[PDB]
Design a protein around this nucleic acid. Structure first.
Lengths: 105, 108, 46, 58
RNA sequence: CACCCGGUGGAUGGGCCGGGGGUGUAAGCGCCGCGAGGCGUUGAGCCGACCGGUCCCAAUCGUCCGAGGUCUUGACC
RNA sequence: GGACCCGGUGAAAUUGAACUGGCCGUGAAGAUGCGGCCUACCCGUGGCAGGACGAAAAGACCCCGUGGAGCUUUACUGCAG
RNA sequence: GCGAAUGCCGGCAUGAGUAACGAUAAAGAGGGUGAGAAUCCCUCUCGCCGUAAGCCCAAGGGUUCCUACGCAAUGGUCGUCAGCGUAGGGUUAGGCGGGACCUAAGGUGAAGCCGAAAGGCGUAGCCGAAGGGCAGCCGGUUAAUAUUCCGGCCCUUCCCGC
RNA sequence: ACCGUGAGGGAAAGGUGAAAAGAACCCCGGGAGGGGAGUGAAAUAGAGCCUGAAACCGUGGGCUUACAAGCAGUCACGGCC
RNA sequence: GGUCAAGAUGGUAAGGGCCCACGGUGGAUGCCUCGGCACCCGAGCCGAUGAAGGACGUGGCUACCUGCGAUAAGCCAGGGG
């Protein structure tokens, strides 16, 4: 619900900033598509597009940064602008097989 | 052949138990990746008690590698008699069953 | 919840305190009781 | 409120027998990509960074 | 858990892409009225699993275990 | 949101003991353990309550001890006033 | 001279690696330290308060407060974090509060009054409080204090002299 | 110590050795704790460290275990050791 | 030498039951003592020249135990050494 989002939110956020973070299996598996999806919008690129992407992310700097910045570095492909890579270790007490994901580059 | 150990070891004797019951009687180096990349706690520990083990030998018990663990075991003892919620009246304590940890390291 | 413990310096003290016990027959009694008898300290001492 | 509780000393025997079906199974691990060593079947590591791309450190 | 299909000589996930379904014509500029709003562009926009394309992405590489063919009698080649 | 799978921790009353199946019969008269029989591989985890006369508590309902404790009146006696 | 008293005391197994993490106000990411960090430090998104999950005066508890070291156990997991360990250090007032003033309840209580003894009562006087009364305030200043320490501004009572 | 506001209750817990000579140094390790050396008559006498039994948890070995009932078991006959 | 058809025995144990060896956990135990218990002979008052009993207190460097207490591990005088 409000949480599913939130996530996708900040994760989508942080990420674009670095372009490959460290969350567990799933977490990543999703932040992908979405974030992913988002991308495809930076690609659309315009009034609208932006008015969305931001709509969620909320933040000029980026929002723009990507739409212009990265977007391009991608204008060509077909989704997938992300390469979700699992990881070797696992957060303690837990034992969760975290994992890392980036913007396929 | 030589051996590693250590009592006053805080931990689930049991749990521990699985630990070896694996890497158990097997090539040094070998399991040395079992516990390196296995899971559940103890490992860490378990590992440890393999290094001062492999060590002790070569060092003062002597032929490297060709070694392994002819045998490995763990015992419980000393408890940790632990107090909990008074039956909301009378005490109910558990016990972090201390934990011993011996383990062989003889040469092929 | 209001147990029955809320101590009250003023209170508890007063109420109980070297003196009093003293002042009293009884009090006095046991007191010098306790004293020898047991050792220890005493109320107010508390 | 202990409606139901055991009724007869569980029997070590059995007891354990129970605790019997249990057991571990060493990590299926493989061996380095070029990292040379044993890794978590499918991953880089404090030995790798590779896979195909240098996405790590050391 | 066991059970089914796939493991880049792949269409298995996602992604994208068409397709459907669903919401009722968007963000903007435009033109009418002091304003509120309306009318247009514009059945727009936006689309969660539904039908199906395309190797953008991610199923790399690797291990382990596994047979041999038990004793007697006879029936045929 | 627990419950389930992971990792970390890790109790608790009751319990002689136990590898504890159904039957129809039985015995102190409502039996997994005795007889005859029929089904019957060894272990487990997610469950569902029936039987183990399940747990809780040496029945409060009962009677029995020329037990006890409280109130009652034209019970016995005695004191206070 | 002991199974054996739902016996007493001590240990030790049960159920059981299932039941619980003490409010369904959620988090997640980047860097940093460390032998080792979901659980520490900085930082950036995000959620919950907001009549509180605010600061304040009390009463109660008394070093729990800060600072440098450290994690064996207590922290219902970790833990380099602590309101945990050791060591050092911290809170100053003519004017704030208590007394150096006042009494009601009440308590004491020379005299007085009655008890088998211990005791009972009890005048005046005394004890007795965020009730009465009383002479200040704003800024600064350390790891902690502050109407007390700084300083600027405002006072009171007693004493000696004239 | 500890529960009790109080009057009051009211525990547990002694033992190395001849004496410390109480373990310098080197090793794995964040440490505790474990491997050697040295004291030594012995340290499986080693720091809550004399004797240190049982219950109860382990590590290996012999035998034994998947058409099978009883805590028990004990009598017969058989194979492995 | 191959094929079919039948007929009977065996190995393989996830844990498990018994026997043996080696730990661990736990402290019984014997033996021991700076402590009691018990009975008998000794002895029998302390107090304002503020007692018995506490409070806070000095050791150079500190909680406790102690002996004193401000002239605080003690200050004088005589006997023993």
């Amino acid at each position: 619900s409000s949480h599913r989002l939130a996530l996708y939110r900040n994760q989508a956020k942080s990420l674009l900033t670095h372009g490959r973070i460290t969350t567990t299996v799933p977490k990543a598996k999703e932040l992908r598509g979405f974030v992913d999806h988002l991308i495809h919008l930076a690609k659309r690129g315009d009034l609208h597009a932006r008015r969305l992407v931001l709509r969620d992310l909320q933040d000029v700097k980026l929002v723009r940064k990507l739409f212009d910045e990265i977007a391009p570095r991608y204008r060509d492909r077909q989704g997938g602008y992300t390469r979700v890579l699992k990881l070797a270790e696992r957060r303690r007490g837990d034992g969760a097989p975290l994992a890392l994901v980036e913007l396929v580059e | 052949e030589a051996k590693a150990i250590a009592r006053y070891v805080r931990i689930s004797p049991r749990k521990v138990r699985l630990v070896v019951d694996l890497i158990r009687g097997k090539s040094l180096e070998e399991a040395r990746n079992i516990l390196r990349y296995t899971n559940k706690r103890g490992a860490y520990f378990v590992a440890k008690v393999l290094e001062s083990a492999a060590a002790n030998a070569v060092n003062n018990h002597d032929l490297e590698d060709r070694l392994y663990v002819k045998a490995a075991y763990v015992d419980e003892g000393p408890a940790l008699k632990r107090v909990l919620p008074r039956a909301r009246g009378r005490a109910d304590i558990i016990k972090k069953r201390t934990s011993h940890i011996t383990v062989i390291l003889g040469e092929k | 919840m209001k147990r029955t413990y809320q101590p009250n310096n003023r209170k508890r003290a007063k109420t109980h305190g070297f003196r009093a016990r003293m002042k009293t027959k009884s009090g006095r009694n046991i007191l010098a009781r306790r004293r020898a008898k047991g050792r220890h300290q005493l109320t107010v001492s508390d | 409120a202990k409606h139901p509780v055991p009724k007869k000393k569980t029997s070590k025997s059995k007891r354990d027998m129970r605790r019997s079906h249990h057991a571990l199974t060493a990590p299926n691990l493989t061996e380095c990509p070029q990292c040379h060593g044993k890794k978590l079947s499918h991953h880089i590591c404090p030995n790798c960074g590779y896979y195909d791309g240098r996405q790590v450190l050391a």
